[PDB]
Design a binder for this molecule. Structure first.
Ligand SMILES: CCCCCCCCCCCCC/C=C/[C@H](O)[C@H](N)CO
Ligand SMILES: CCCCCCCCCCCCC/C=C/[C@H](O)[C@H](N)CO
Lengths: 285, 251, 238, 59, 238, 285, 59, 60, 59
């Protein structure tokens, strides 16, 4: 069986031919007080020729705009140390620490989508005086813990049994690991802004951290080895797909300060020029 | 074409110099349907005791005035039976009709922007800090935008150019809005439906939208024209529903 | 098994690929979809909305509302020019932080017509007429009303309707221009002049101001996605 | 065998492709890159009374 | 052979994948299926069965049957409250080790209505009436019968039928609540009061006890599987 | 040829609208003495609105509940030693040593399914004073011995010929090995609890070990090498599929003691609180 | 070629997938994750005489 | 998954191969085609055009 | 399933092959090596009046 699926191409409007006019129709006179934006084209104000326009608005749809991978977290962890908390990495899941993807997401109030997640892991040797040894390939474990699950205390804790938590095992020299996640929220859509509190007495925690609660990630080395110490760095990449967004907002002007708040320092509207009439001259012999 | 009349409950507003009416995103308020509900108990619908125009207190537009904002709900929690139905239930839901009035003579000048911002989350004047609710809202009294950068603790960073949200104030036209240009009209009207990511919500914990009034062209006049020019707001809830009746909460 | 041969590109991570991948949560049951008002389907819907242009971006006014007002007054000021700027919707300081500018800075190429709306915010007793002119590239910017009248222009008469639209039509040798405009893809300039002057009776303020809004027409489009230069950090947790 | 055949993105002035779904969950499918709808009037014309654009806005 | 290209995710072990694999015992012939009574097809069938709630979980009674009995007696005790607890079917000590609680602790999200059945276990000559009340979140718990009567309640009359059901209906702003409940997804409280009091004739014991059973209704469901915090070991062979 | 298979979605019941009532119907009065559980809904006790419920009980079916991989055994073995019994690992097959999967399985009396088995093998270097050598990739052998087969005595025993036993050969740096096993029991279903003996005189061995008898696993290094000693650890993961279960039971309250018995230490029913009326106050200014 | 096409798990308010079996034993097939039946009355109502729920339980 | 076996020639780069490859710019919209005069379809069209021969190629 | 079958390049004096497209963009397809058109008169005979070749060129 084969099924033919049709794809409607969507191009921009053609401009029509127009001639001289002398009448009572005033397309160029409006009133912005109504909250309405004028729908006037060049053919209403000047004389125009007919043009057949073949341009398409395909790369500005929301799906093509948001469906690319971006880094959201980077972290380090060791194979040998004297701290036992630096032997594994762990963090809470969100998209608020890297400013590019998070400014791109905050153009809208609410978003809903599935996700594709990729990891990029690299290792390196720690600076020691005596070098020289052959080491077998390293293996890494990534575990996702939804809220309420037990938390590892070390790299040999029983919790890495991962009986019900989903985990990834990977070894260096292969393709980067990848998996997809569905839309997981107790609400009908994700919320990027929340003008409210956590306690009914209008106090407690304000803003975004009240609503996310999506678990944690833990990463470790599996070998448990290496008399000479090594160091690994893990980077995580998000890619949304099957997207829907609501209620657009003005883009962020000020620089970000931290991952919890919308706090900012006052910034200008733009940079200056000489005077309200200044023109740069570019046609000179 | 410039005259308009709006009736709700036992209240009516007339106007003789209106521009038009903005319907937020082409959507009128309505009740919750059966294939979108999650709460199971039968809801109450008072329908004329709550859905009527309430008037707040007025502000004075001066020659150097930065602007004002209110938070909705929590500006109507002491208004008649709407406030009482807010105090006894866990979940509420309503749309609104907003009407702003400001009149002046043909020898005055000035221009105001009237805008409704959903989920307007604000920042503190101390960047290593958090806000409190008194700095966000004073009920029926308005908060005041500032003229320069603010300092000190516990106050909201309120210089008008950033609108206290870290954006450019000239882009707020992305939201539902109108203008009051003193030579053209004397009132603005916005009809706002229920906008949230869940079908109902608690009305004390969550501010659904902020109302901002910001003058772009200051007020000016000459020798012996009237100096006192007030601005007045009037709001009416629509399709109001409540769920989860228990004893009255106390703030 | 089946004989196969691996081609170049195997085991690489391309950040704009489109493949299938296994699910880490088999048979998860998602929350039903709710019909929230205000759904967006294309970024061009946002760029077609008017936003206010900071035309008066001179020293000392970058953080006040005065950055948005264009000053005009009564008396004999015909020899004085009202305002002027270049047409660079993603490059010029005048246009770069508006809605249209902010959308264009995510892209490399743009094309289409541009709408500028002007609103007079004086008293109801003031009268006047203005000339709004757009000149195509190839010459220097006009220095007088006589030069400016030779390009594409409109004469605005102030009255009961408060707003007048100047439409800049797409006149270009290429199908697209660069968002990072150079001398090769220049687009021209816009200027304003007194056509008659402002006349008021006694008892009215003499000075008035004008405001300008920008938006995109229904033949507008962009392409070639890129990262924006307006946001940056020096370390994580920001 | 549950194959979908659809047209490719080309220019203007052999061109179709084939897809098979391998997994049981729809969250595993690839992105929907070929849906192009618009509704700008929701943001640019949100007024109760219609405005003709050749008529005056007021009066 | 056929040209191919490997994507990210190759050669990984995901513990919730669903693939095919070769058999280590080709053509093995399994024992025929027998029709054993009591087959289970869904975990929600177990959560719809009543189980006894340990309402009296105070110091000194955690390992006796007294943990299951609610005490009541005759005389003027109207000002005294009978019992009260929060509605946290997987979090509160009162509900966490029952059948419904044990099933919920394998999941992260729950939704639906909850049934509480009360049985009077006094003599056949004792009479009385009680008020059973559920209050929604948003206020503090009631301190008197007058406050409690304002929420969702039922008046139970003791007679030939021994059991009365209080149904807690799903009243929530979200579709699901967390099994690990916080202040944002709170669900309210339940309280009991004397509506009239207990009356007995001569020759009967004065004190009596009440028991409470919990189960789930036919609109109940859970999602987001996880590991339970109730079982643990310190080494293998356990 | 293509065959269309239909999948019936199963959602929960809708709640119907109900109004006031004054009659002799008493839905809220019951009697628990019968052993019957009341089938009352909110619409029988209060006034309700009509709601269309779209929630599905898909993740609580037995198959989705049990079809995940869990660790069931871990063991160590060397390449060089002075014991010759520590050069290979061996164990008897069951699912009673890791408490998570075994508590999950014991919710039912009888179970029947096929299995998917995965192995995760890692190696490491033994701590010596002089390091530095290059070692070729290591290969490992896993052999399954059904009851009655000969038992290896060393790592060079003839029994690793594996002429009829199934074995796996694997080398480090590749994907983890995996294979599937059918339902292998002389009974019609597996038994998790057995209240009986092995001898007809009501003595001998009591309980679970009477009935399982499913063979052993042996694992060794194939290289037979490494003047500098190494150490490997093997972990085994089970995943049941095509499941059927009977006769549900109450979940285990006490902690496990050993893998043979159901022995326990007496535990409480729950933890305490202040008094039978105690309420935590959360609405305070 | 012995292909099965069935619907994917989606939400509510192109969606099917294809499977081929490669091995001779049915113990090699993937899990049956899309069968949702119920019979709760076996555990909640195991009584000989039917109880109506609007009638008294006794008398 | 499906059992397979790799043949000689795997993972090589032959500079005259003809395979498919993933796009680094998904759904990019190209400029429309213009009808420019003088389109060439085969190199033999150029060799059929006369050109002048340097017959007198002697020193100086 | 959107398969194209076409003839192979052979000699003169079983011979066809199969192709499936895997990607959504046409820029991912393989080269078009089997299109052989010609129009030499554009470069060799670009004159307004036709020249017969058995007649004199002039007169
Ligand atoms: C260990 C294998 C699985 C790896 C775990 C990855 C799962 C990550 C949880 C999915 C969360 C994706 C949606 C969250 C993003 C935020 O909602 C956005 N910033 C908008 O709110
Ligand atoms: C060497 C390659 C094959 C690897 C050998 C693995 C075969 C394992 C034997 C299958 C036993 C699976 C069923 C046993 C589990 C118990 O029955 C459960 N605990 C319930 O009784």
């Amino acid at each position: 069986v084969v099924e033919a699926v049709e794809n409607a191409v969507a191009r921009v409007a053609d401009t029509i031919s127009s001639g001289p006019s002398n009448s009572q129709a005033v397309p160029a006179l409006t009133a912005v007080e109504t909250g309405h934006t004028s729908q006037v084209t060049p053919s209403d104000t000047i004389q125009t020729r007919h043009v057949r326009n073949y341009h398409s608005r395909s790369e500005s749809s929301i799906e093509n705009f948001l469906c690319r991978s971006a880094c959201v977290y980077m972290g380090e962890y060791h194979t040998t140390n004297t701290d036992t908390s630096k032997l594994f990495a762990s963090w809470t899941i969100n998209a608020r620490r890297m400013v590019q993807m998070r400014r791109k997401l905050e153009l809208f109030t609410y978003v809903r989508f599935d996700m594709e997640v990729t990891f990029v892991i690299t290792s390196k040797q720690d600076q020691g005086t005596q070098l020289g040894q052959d080491m077998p390939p390293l293996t890494h474990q990534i575990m996702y813990i939804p809220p309420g699950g037990p938390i590892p205390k070390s790299v040999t804790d029983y919790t890495w049994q991962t009986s019900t938590n989903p985990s990834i095992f990977w070894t260096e020299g292969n393709a980067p690991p990848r998996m997809s996640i569905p839309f997981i929220s107790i609400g009908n859509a994700y919320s990027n802004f929340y003008d409210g509190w956590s306690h009914f007495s209008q106090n407690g925690v304000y803003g975004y951290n009240t609503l996310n609660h999506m678990g944690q990630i833990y990463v470790r080395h599996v070998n448990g080895s290496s008399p000479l110490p090594m160091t690994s760095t893990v980077r995580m990449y998000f890619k949304p797909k099957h997207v829907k967004v609501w209620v657009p907002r003005p883009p962020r002007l000020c620089q970000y300060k931290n991952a919890s708040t919308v706090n900012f320092t006052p910034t200008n509207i733009t940079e200056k020029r000489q005077s309200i009439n200044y023109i740069p001259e570019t046609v000179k012999p | 074409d410039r005259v308009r009349s709006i009736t709700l409950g036992n209240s009516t507003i007339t106007t003789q110099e209106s521009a038009n009416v903005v319907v937020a995103y082409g959507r009128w308020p309505e009740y919750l349907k059966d294939n979108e509900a999650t709460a199971e108990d039968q809801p109450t619908q008072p329908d004329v005791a709550t859905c009527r125009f309430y008037t707040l207190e007025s502000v004075t537009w001066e020659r150097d005035s930065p602007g004002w904002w209110w938070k909705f709900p929590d500006a109507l929690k002491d208004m008649g039976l709407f406030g009482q139905n807010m105090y006894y239930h866990y979940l509420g839901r309503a749309g609104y009709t907003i009407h702003v009035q400001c009149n002046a003579s043909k020898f005055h000048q000035g221009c105001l922007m009237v805008v409704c911002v959903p989920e307007a989350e604000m920042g503190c004047s101390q960047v290593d800090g958090t806000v409190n609710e008194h700095s966000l809202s004073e009920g029926e009294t308005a908060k005041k935008f500032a003229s320069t950068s603010t300092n000190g603790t516990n106050t909201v960073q309120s210089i008008v150019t950033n609108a206290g949200m870290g954006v450019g104030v000239g882009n707020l036209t992305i939201f539902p809005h109108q203008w009051i240009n003193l030579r053209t009209n004397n009132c603005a009207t916005i009809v706002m439906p229920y906008i949230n990511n869940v079908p109902m919500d608690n009305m004390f914990r969550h501010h659904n939208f902020t109302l901002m009034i910001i003058p772009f062209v200051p007020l000016d006049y000459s020798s012996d024209s009237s100096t006192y020019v007030p601005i007045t707001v009037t709001v009416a809830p629509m399709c109001a529903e409540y769920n989860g009746l228990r004893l009255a909460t106390s703030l | 098994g089946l004989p196969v041969m691996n081609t170049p590109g195997s085991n690489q991570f391309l950040t704009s690929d489109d493949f299938q991948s296994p699910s880490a949560m088999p048979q998860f049951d998602v929350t039903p979809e709710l019909n929230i008002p205000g759904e967006v389907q294309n970024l061009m819907e946002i760029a077609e909305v008017d936003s206010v242009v900071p035309v008066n971006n001179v020293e000392g006014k970058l953080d006040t509302m005065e950055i948005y007002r264009i000053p005009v007054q009564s008396g004999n000021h015909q020899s004085s020019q009202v305002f002027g700027f270049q047409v660079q919707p993603g490059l010029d300081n005048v246009f770069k932080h508006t809605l249209l500018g902010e959308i264009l800075n995510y892209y490399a190429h743009w094309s289409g017509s541009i709408k500028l709306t002007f609103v007079f915010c004086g008293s109801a007793m003031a009268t006047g007429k203005f000339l709004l002119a757009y000149a195509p590239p190839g010459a220097n910017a006009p220095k007088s009303r006589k030069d400016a009248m030779l390009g594409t222009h409109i004469i605005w008469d102030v009255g009961l309707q408060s707003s007048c639209v100047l439409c800049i039509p797409w006149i270009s040798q290429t199908h697209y221009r660069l968002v990072q405009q150079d001398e090769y893809t220049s687009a021209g300039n816009v200027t304003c002049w007194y056509q008659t002057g402002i006349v008021v009776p006694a008892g009215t303020p003499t000075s008035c101001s004008i405001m300008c809004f920008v938006s995109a027409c229904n033949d507008f489009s962009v392409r070639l996605l890129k990262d924006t230069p307006f946001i940056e950090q020096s370390a994580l947790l920001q | 065998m549950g194959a979908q055949v659809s047209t490719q993105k080309t220019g203007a002035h052999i061109i179709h492709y084939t897809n098979i779904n391998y997994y049981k969950d729809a969250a595993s499918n690839s992105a929907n890159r070929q849906d192009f709808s618009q509704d700008p009037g929701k943001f640019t014309e949100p007024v109760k009374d219609i405005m003709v654009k050749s008529l005056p806005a007021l009066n």
